[PDB]
Amino acid sequence: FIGKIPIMLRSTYCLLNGLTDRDLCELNECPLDPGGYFIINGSEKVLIA
Amino acid sequence: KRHIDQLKEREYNNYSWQDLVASGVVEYIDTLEEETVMLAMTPDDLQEKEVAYCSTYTHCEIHPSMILGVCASIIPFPDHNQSPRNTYQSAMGKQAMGVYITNFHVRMDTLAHVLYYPQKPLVTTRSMEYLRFRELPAGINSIVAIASYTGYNQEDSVIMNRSAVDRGFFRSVFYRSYKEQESKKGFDQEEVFEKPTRETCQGMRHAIYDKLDDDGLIAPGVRVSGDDVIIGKTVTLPENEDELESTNRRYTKRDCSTFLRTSETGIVDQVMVTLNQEGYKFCKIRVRSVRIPQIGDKFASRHGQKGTCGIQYRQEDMPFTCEGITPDIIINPHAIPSRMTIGHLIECLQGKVSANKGEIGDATPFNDAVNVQKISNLLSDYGYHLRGNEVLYNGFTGRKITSQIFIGPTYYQRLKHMVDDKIHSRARGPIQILNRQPMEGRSRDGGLRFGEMERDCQIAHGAAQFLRERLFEASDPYQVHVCNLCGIMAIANTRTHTYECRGCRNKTQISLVRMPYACKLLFQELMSMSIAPRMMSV
Amino acid sequence: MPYANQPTVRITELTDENVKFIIENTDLAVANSIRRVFIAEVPIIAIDWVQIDANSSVLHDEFIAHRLGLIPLISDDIVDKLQYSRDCTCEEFCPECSVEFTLDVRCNEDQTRHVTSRDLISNSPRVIPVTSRNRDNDPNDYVEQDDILIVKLRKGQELRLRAYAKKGFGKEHAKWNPTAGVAFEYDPDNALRHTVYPKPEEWPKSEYSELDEDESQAPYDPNGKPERFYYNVESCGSLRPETIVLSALSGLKKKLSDLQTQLSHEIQSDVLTIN
Amino acid sequence: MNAPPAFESFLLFEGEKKITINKDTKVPNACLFTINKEDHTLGNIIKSQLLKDPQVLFAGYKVPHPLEHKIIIRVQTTPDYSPQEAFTNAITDLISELSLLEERFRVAIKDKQEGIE
Amino acid sequence: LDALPRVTCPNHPDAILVEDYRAGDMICPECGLVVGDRVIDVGSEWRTRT
Amino acid sequence: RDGKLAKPRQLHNTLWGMVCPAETPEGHAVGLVKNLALMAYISVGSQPS
Amino acid sequence: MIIPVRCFTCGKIVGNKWEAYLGLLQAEYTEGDALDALGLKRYCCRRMLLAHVDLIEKLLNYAPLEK
Amino acid sequence: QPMIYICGECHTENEIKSRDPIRCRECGYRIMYKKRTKRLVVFDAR
Amino acid sequence: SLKQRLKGKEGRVRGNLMGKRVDFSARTVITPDPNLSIDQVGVPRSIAANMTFAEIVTPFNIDRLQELVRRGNSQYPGAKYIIRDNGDRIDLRFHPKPSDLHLQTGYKVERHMCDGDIVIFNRQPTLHKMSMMGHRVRILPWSTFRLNLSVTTPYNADFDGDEMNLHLPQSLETRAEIQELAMVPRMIVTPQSNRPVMGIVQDTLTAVRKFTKRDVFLERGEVMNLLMFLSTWDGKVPQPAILKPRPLWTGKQIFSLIIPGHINCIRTHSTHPDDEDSGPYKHISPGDTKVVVENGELIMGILCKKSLGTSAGSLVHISYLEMGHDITRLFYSNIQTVINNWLLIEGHTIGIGDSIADSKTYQDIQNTIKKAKQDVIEVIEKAHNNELEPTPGNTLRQTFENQVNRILNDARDKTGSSAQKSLSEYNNFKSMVVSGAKGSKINISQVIAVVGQQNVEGKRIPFGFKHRTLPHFIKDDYGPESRGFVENSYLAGLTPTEFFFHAMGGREGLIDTAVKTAETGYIQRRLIKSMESVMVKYDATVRNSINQVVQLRYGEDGLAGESVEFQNLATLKPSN
Ligand SMILES: [Mg+2]
Ligand SMILES: [Mg+2]
Ligand SMILES: [Zn+2]
Ligand SMILES: [Zn+2]
Ligand SMILES: [Zn+2]
Ligand SMILES: [Zn+2]
Ligand SMILES: [Zn+2]
C-alpha cells in the first residue's frame, strides 16, 4: 500500500459514471451534476487552468 | 444530407460523433493549422461563384455562435447590444440567484438561494438546451413597460408591482447550514454537548438554553433568532485547581455553547449528526430562511441592465392598458439608449409576439428571419400596433397617457445582493481596548470604517472640531496626568486620593491632559525604545 | 348640490366568471376609483392561520402555506357576516371570525398520489368551502372541478396540517382580491386626443371602436368629454362578478359615510359652528 | 421586516384621527384640511366635486408623500360661503349619486333575469 | 475599588450584573445600572537547531 | 509574473473561436481572466515516434 | 414548477390545467389548440403556462425521498 | 424526551436520551436525524 | 518587531491613525426619491431604532424628555438610556420602573434618533468637498437610503448597488458646525471651477424640454392640481393665458410661476435648433429656439442643461447669488416635484419605432456606403500599382491608412447626417438627445446606421493572424472589415467578425477604467500629502504650517473663487 489518491468526479474510477440518472437519484445523486472536481474534506474543489 | 439521416439514426441505433470524426467530413483544428487554412464563414454564400473574390476556402465554421461562452450564449442578439453590457451580464449572470441541481434536500451548503417559480426563457438560444438551462432556469420572463413614471426608477433601478409580490413575485428560500464539532481541549479538557442551566454553568453571559434539548441541540422546526444559543456545550478546565468549595453548580463548567450571530431570524430546517476522518463526533444543522423582494434589493435584466427595486406599488396605483394590464416592472427608458441596448427591446418584441403566437422564438443572433418588419407585421396580425408601442391608462386619474408605451415580456435576474446583509451601523458597543478601536465589523457588531480620504475631505472641510469629535470622541477618548516638572506622563494616581509623579517627587503639581488612548500607547512604545518625549503648553 | 351626473348604467354581458357592461354619464375619476374599488376594497375570507402537524412530502411547509394563501376560496356565503378577529375580541380567533380547516394525507399506494383542495376540509360550520365539486353538483364542470392539485405524493409521503380562514380584503393582500384583470374602455376614436396615435392605421381597431366604426383614421372633437365607459369585470372565481360589483358599490358608499360622520365629528370636536 | 404591516396603510392608531381641520392663515374664507390614512383616489373626485361648485375660489389636495398615507386639502370659497359647506355639500351630493348608480345598476342587472333577446 | 468581581453600586451593593452582549452593555437592573466598562466582550470574544 | 510592464492584456486575434471575448470578470482581473470557448478542446499529448 | 394558481399578470387560475394541457398535448400536438382549449385567451396567461416547467417528477425519480 | 435520532440510512428513530456514540441499531451508519419539534407553530398563508 | 509595530505597515500610523472605525455611523445601499427635499435623506427605522442621541435635560422639554424615558426602548419615540450629571448611566430596558424613574435638569438622556436631525453624509470613495455633506434625516420603511436625484449629482451615486456612508454628530457645536458648513445648500457652487455642482437630469431634464414645447396647454382643473404640488405658492391664482374660444394656461406661464419673481437668466438656449450664429438673427422672430426670461417670466426658449446648471451662464448660479442657497433649494425641490408630477401624467417611453427612419434615406445610406466601399477599392488599386502619391513628410502606407480613414469617416458622417435628418422631432430618442440627456447623433449612427471603424490605439486592427486578422479573410486583405470597421448598425446587428472587434475595444475602455480607478486613489495621496501643509491666514497672506508666507494674498486678491464669474471685458475692441 502506497497511498490514497483523491479522484476527480465522473472519473473512469468514479463507478457512478456508468449508473443511470435513475441509479443516481437512487443514490440521491444529481444526474445533471457531472462533477469533474475533487471533494476535499467534504468541500468541492476545482482546478483553474 | 444522408449523413444527417445517420445522425438521426443515432437517436435510436448508432452513429457516433466519433464516426462523424471517423467520417473525416469534419476535423479538429488548432491555431497553427488555422494560420494556413482558408476558413469559410458560411457554406451557402461562399460557395457562390458569381462574386467569388476567393473560392480557395478549405474549411468552414459549424456556427459563429461557437465562439461564445456559457454566459454570452444566454443573451439573444448581443450584437444589437453594446459589447461591454454583455461582459457585465456575463459577470452579473454569475451574480444572479437561482437553482443549481436537483437534490437540494440532501444538499446542506452554508448558503443557498432558490426561486419558487423559475421560468425557462421565452426567447431561447438553442445551445441553452445543451446547457440544460431550460431544465434549470434562473429567472422568469416578466412583462415590463418602459416608462420613467415618478423617477423612482431613475439610475439603475425599477418600480415593481407590490400586488404581484403578493402573488409570489420572485420570492425565494434561503438556506444556511450550520455545522458544529465536539473535540478534546487537552489531555483531559474537552467540549461537552449539553443543556446547562444558568446556575450549573458560567460564561453564559445572559443567554438562556430553553431552545436546547438535553443533548444540547435545538429541535428541528424550531423558530430561531439572532441571539439564542443554537448548540449547547460546556468545558470544565482545571478539575483540581478550583478545589475546596468555590464549588458552585457552575464549578469550572465554562461555556462554549454555540449561539447565532446577532442578525439572523428564522426557523430550523434540518439536523444531522455524524463522524469524520478526525474521528471526533460532529453535527450539521440546516436553517431555513425566506427571501422576498424588497425596495432597494438588486435585480437585473437578461441584457446586463441591472437595477434595484426603487419602490413597490399596489396594482391599482399602477398605470394600465386597454385591458388594464399593469406591467410587472417599470423601467426608465433613458437607461437603454445611453447604454445602447437595442437587444433588450428585441427580447420584448420577440417575446410579445411569441406569447401571442403561443410559441417560442429562437435567440440566435444570426438569422435570415428578418426579425424587424416580419415580426412587426406579425404583431399587427395578432391585433396590435406593429411597433409594439401601446397606449395605457393612468393608475390614478385613469386618463390615457399622452405618450404611447412599448410593453412586453422579459427574462429577469434576481441578483445575489441581499441589501439587508449590506447595511451596517452602530452608535455604541464592544470596542478593541488593545487599541480602543471599534470591533472589526457587523458580525461582531462593530463600528464603521473611517478612511484617509474622509479625513482629507474633513481637512478640506475645515470642520476640525467634527474630526476631533470623530477621531477623539467617536473613537478614542483619553485623560492623562502629567508632572508639571516634566512633560513625561508619570503618575501612580490614587484614583480617589493622591496622584504624584515618582522620579520627580511631585506631590501637587499634577496636570490633566486629553489625548487618544491609542496615541498614549504609541508614546509608551517610544519610551520602550528609550525615548523620552515630553509636551507642554509652554 | 344643484346638479350631479345621472350615472347612466347599461349591462352588456354577464357570467359567473365575468361581467361586461357600459356605464355612462359619469366622471373618469369615479370610473377609475370604483375600478380600484373592484380589486382592493372588497372584503373576503382567506386563511391566516396554518399549523402543519406532519409532512413527509418533499416540499417544505412554508411553500404549501404560501400556496394555501394561493387557494381561491369562493366567497358565496356572505363572508361579510363574520366579525373581524381583531374586533371580535376573541382569544386570537373564533368561528364568529374564523373558519377552521384540516388536511391529513398519507401515500401508502405505490404509485404517485395527488393531493387536492378536497383533502382540506372546513372543520368550522360549512360556510361554502373551496370550489371543488361543491358548487357543481352541476353537469357543467370544467373537466373535473378539481380546481387545485395541492401536491403529489410518491409512496411513503404524508401530510398533516390545520388551517384557519379569516376575514380580509384585496388591499390587505392580493389573495383577498376577488378579481383578476379589470377591462375598461372609453372613447376609442380618440376624439379627446389623449394620445397622438400617429398614423392611425398602425393602430388596430378596438371592439368598441367598431361602434363608432370609422375609416377616417380617428375623428376629433376638442369640446369632448370622457363618456360611455365600457366595462368587463373578470372575477377570479371567488364570487360572481356582478355581485362583487354591488358589494364594491356598497363598501365605497359605507367608506364615504364614515368620513362624513367623521366630518361631522371634525366640526363637532371643533369650536366651529354651522347652524 | 424594516417596514410596517399592510393594515397600517389604512388602519389608524388610537392616537390618530382620520382627518384634521385647519383654517388658512393666508387668505380669507379659506382652510386647509388634513386627512390621514387616505389617498388621491378619494381626493380627486372631491376636488372635482368642489370644482363643479362655482362658489369655490380655490380647491386642491396632495399626499405629503406617496409612501405616506395622508392627504391635505386647501379650499377657498366666496366670503359668504364657507369651505366647510362646500366639502359637506360635495360629499352629500356624491354619496347621493352613488346610491342612484347602485339602484340603476340593480335595475340594469335585474333587467335580464333571462335574456334581452 | 477592589470590590469589583461582579457586583457593586454607589447606592447599593449590586445583587446581579447582567451582560448584554447584543448592545455590549453591562446592566444592573434593580436600580437602573450602567456599572460602566464593557471590556471588549467575552461573548464577542467567545468566537475566539536545538 | 515573468515578463512584466509594456505587455498588458487587450486581445489576440487567434483567440477567435478559442475563447469567449465577453466572458470575463469586471474586476481588475479583467482580460487577465479567460474562459473556454463553447467547442474548444485541449491536446492531451501523444508519441509521434 | 408546481403551476402557481392565478396568472401573475392577471390572476387567471390554472391549478389543474397544466396536466390537462399535458393531456391536451398527448391528445393534440397543437399548442395553439391546447392553449386555446384551456381558455387562456390572454398571452400573459399563455406565457405563464408556455414557459412553465416541472422538474419535480425528476425529484420524484429518487427513491430515498423516504426520510 | 422520546425524541433523539432517526438514523439517516435505515431511516429509523433510535429515540432515547443517551450519550451513546451516535450509534444505530442494525444500520451501522452514524448519520442521524432528529424528529420534528413538538411545539405549537402558527403559519400565515401570506 | 517593535519598530514595525509602530512603523506604519498596519502600524500605529497607517493601521490606526490614518484609518480606523467610528460609532454613530451607518451605511446601506442607495435608492432614489425625487420627492425628498435636497436636505432630506431617507433613513431605515431599524437604523433609527439603532441610532440614538444623548440630550442634556432642560426644564423647557424635561417633561417630554421624561416621556421618552417613560416610553423607553419599547418603542421608537422613546429613550434607551439616561446619563446623570455625576456620570451615572441607566438602562431603561432593565430598569424596574422606567416611567417612575426620577430625572432632573442637567442629566443626559440617550433618546432614539428623530427626524429633522442633521447628519453628515459621504460617498466612499471621497474625492472632493461636496463628497461629504450635512443632511436632514427622513425615517422610513425598508433598510434603504432614499435621496433626491439632484443630490446624486455631486455624489455621482448609482443605484446599481452603491453604498455610501453617514455620520451623526453628538455635539451641538458640531451640529451647528455641520449646519453652518457641511449642509448641502452651501455646496451648490464649486470654487474649483467657479461653477454650480447641482444638476437636474434624465427624466426631469427630458420632461422640461417636453414642457417648453409651444404645443403645451393646460386646463384650469389641472392648474389647481399643479398648484397643490407646489412646495410654496402665493395663494393667488394667476390669470389664464387664453380666454377665447376657451380659457387656458401655458406651460411657460406655469414654469414661470415656479420661477422666483424678480430675477432673470438670458442668452443660453444652448440647443441645436434655429442655427449657428446668424440664421436666428435672420429677422428676429427671436423664436422658440432661444431662451429668454423676464421678471421671473419665461418669454420663449426650449431649456437645456447649460441653462439648468453645472455650467457658466446658468440660472442656478445667479439664483444662488441673488436668492441665496435657501430660496434656491426650495425652488429646486419644488420644480423637481412639479416636473415629476407632470412627467408622471404626461408620461414618456421608448421603442423600436424610435429606431425607425425613412427607407429611401436608409436605402440611400447603404448606397452611400457602397460608393465608399468602391472609393476604398480605388485607393487600394492605385497603391498596388505603386502609382499612389505618398503625403509629404509621410510614408505611402501612412498616407494610405490615413486616406482610407478619411473615407470611412466622411461616409459614416454623411450617412449619420442622413439619419439625423431622417428622424422626426416626435421621436423620444431625438427628444432625449436634444434635452441634453444621455445621448447624441453618433449614437443614432451606431444604433440606426453604422458603428464605424474599430481601432487599436487609433490604428486599424493589426494583422495578428499572419498578415491577416482572421482565416475568413484572404491574405493581404485590406478591407475595412479586415481591419475592424463595423459597417452595420445596432439595429442591423453585427457580423461575427465585427462583434469580436467590438468586444476588443470594450476591453480597452474597461481595462483603462480599472487601471484609472486604482491610480487616481494613489496619485491623490501623493498630492494631498504635499498640499496639506498650507492654509489661508487672517492677514490675507497665504502661509504654511511653519507660518512662512506662500503668497501676499490668496490668488493675489484674497477673494472667494465662487464669487468669480465669466465676463467679457470687450475693451480689446478692434478699431480704436
Ligand atoms: Mg456610481
Ligand atoms: Mg447614476
Ligand atoms: Zn515628573
Ligand atoms: Zn372572534
Ligand atoms: Zn444597582
Ligand atoms: Zn394572465
Ligand atoms: Zn441506521
UniProtKB/Swiss-Prot annotation, chain C:
Zn(2+) binds at C88, C90, C94, C97. Its main location: nucleus. Residues 203-226 are annotated as: Disordered. The keyword tRNA-binding does not apply. GO terms for molecular function: DNA binding; DNA-directed RNA polymerase activity; protein dimerization activity. InterPro entries: DNA-dir_RNA_pol_30-40kDasu_CS (IPR001514), DNA-dir_RNA_pol_insert (IPR011262), DNA-dir_RNA_pol_RpoA/D/Rpb3 (IPR011263), RBP11-like (IPR036603), RNAP_Rpo3/Rpb3/RPAC1 (IPR022842), RNApol_insert_sf (IPR036643), Rpo3/RPB3_RNA_Pol_subunit (IPR050518). The modification Phosphoserine is found at S124, S257. Belongs to the archaeal Rpo3/eukaryotic RPB3 RNA polymerase subunit family. Component of the RNA polymerase II (Pol II) core complex consisting of 12 subunits: a ten-subunit catalytic core composed of POLR2A/RPB1, POLR2B/RPB2, POLR2C/RPB3, POLR2I/RPB9, POLR2J/RPB11, POLR2E/RPABC1, POLR2F/RPABC2, POLR2H/RPABC3, POLR2K/RPABC4 and POLR2L/RPABC5 and a mobile stalk composed of two subunits POLR2D/RPB4 and POLR2G/RPB7, protruding from the core and functioning primarily in transcription initiation. Part of Pol II(G) complex, in which Pol II core associates with an additional subunit POLR2M; unlike conventional Pol II, Pol II(G) functions as a transcriptional repressor. Core component of RNA polymerase II (Pol II), a DNA-dependent RNA polymerase which synthesizes mRNA precursors and many functional non-coding RNAs using the four ribonucleoside triphosphates as substrates.
From Swiss-Prot, chain E:
Zn(2+) binds at C9, H12, C28, C31. It comes from Homo sapiens (Human). This is Transcription initiation factor IIB. The chain holds residues 7 to 106 of 316 of the full protein. A zinc finger (TFIIB-type) spans 5-36. Expressed in the inner cell mass forming the embryoblast. Not detected in cells from the outer thin layer trophoblast (at protein level). Acetylated. The gene is GTF2B. It is found in: Nucleus; Chromosome. Belongs to the TFIIB family. DNA binds at R47. Found in a ternary complex with TATA box-bound TBP. Part of a TFIID-containing RNA polymerase II pre-initiation complex (PIC) that is composed of TBP and at least GTF2A1, GTF2A2, GTF2E1, GTF2E2, GTF2F1, GTF2H2, GTF2H3, GTF2H4, GTF2H5, GTF2B, TCEA1, ERCC2, ERCC3, TAF1, TAF2, TAF3, TAF4, TAF5, TAF6, TAF7, TAF8, TAF9, TAF10, TAF11, TAF12 and TAF13. Associates with TFIID-TFIIA (DA complex) to form TFIID-TFIIA-TFIIB (DAB complex), which is then recognized by RNA polymerase II (Pol II). Found in a RNA polymerase II initiation complex. (Microbial infection) Interacts with HIV-1 Vpr. The TFIIB-type zinc-binding domain is necessary for the interaction and recruitment of RNA polymerase II to the core promoter, the formation of a fully competent pre-initiation complex (PIC) assembly and basal transcription initiation. The C-terminus is necessary and sufficient for interaction with the TATA box-bound TBP complex and for the formation of PIC.
UniProtKB/Swiss-Prot annotation, chain F:
It is found in: Nucleus. It comes from the Eukaryota. Belongs to the RNA polymerase beta chain family. Component of the RNA polymerase II (Pol II) core complex consisting of 12 subunits: a ten-subunit catalytic core composed of POLR2A/RPB1, POLR2B/RPB2, POLR2C/RPB3, POLR2I/RPB9, POLR2J/RPB11, POLR2E/RPABC1, POLR2F/RPABC2, POLR2H/RPABC3, POLR2K/RPABC4 and POLR2L/RPABC5 and a mobile stalk composed of two subunits POLR2D/RPB4 and POLR2G/RPB7, protruding from the core and functioning primarily in transcription initiation. Part of Pol II(G) complex, in which Pol II core associates with an additional subunit POLR2M; unlike conventional Pol II, Pol II(G) functions as a transcriptional repressor. This is DNA-directed RNA polymerase II subunit RPB2. The lineage of its organism: Eukaryota, Metazoa, Chordata, Craniata, Vertebrata. The gene is POLR2B. The chain holds residues 491 to 539 of 1174 of the full protein.
From Swiss-Prot, chain H:
One of its GO terms (biological process) is transcription by RNA polymerase II. Belongs to the archaeal Rpo12/eukaryotic RPC10 RNA polymerase subunit family. The chain holds residues 13 to 58 of 58 of the full protein. One of its GO terms (cellular component) is RNA polymerase III complex. This is DNA-directed RNA polymerases I, II, and III subunit RPABC4. It comes from the Eukaryota. The lineage of its organism: Eukaryota, Metazoa, Chordata, Craniata, Vertebrata. Component of the RNA polymerase I (Pol I), RNA polymerase II (Pol II) and RNA polymerase III (Pol III) complexes consisting of at least 13, 12 and 17 subunits, respectively. Pol I complex consists of a ten-subunit catalytic core composed of POLR1A/RPA1, POLR1B/RPA2, POLR1C/RPAC1, POLR1D/RPAC2, POLR1H/RPA12, POLR2E/RPABC1, POLR2F/RPABC2, POLR2H/RPABC3, POLR2K/RPABC4 and POLR2L/RPABC5; a mobile stalk subunit POLR1F/RPA43 protruding from the core and additional subunits homologous to general transcription factors POLR1E/RPA49 and POLR1G/RPA34. Disulfide bonds: none annotated.
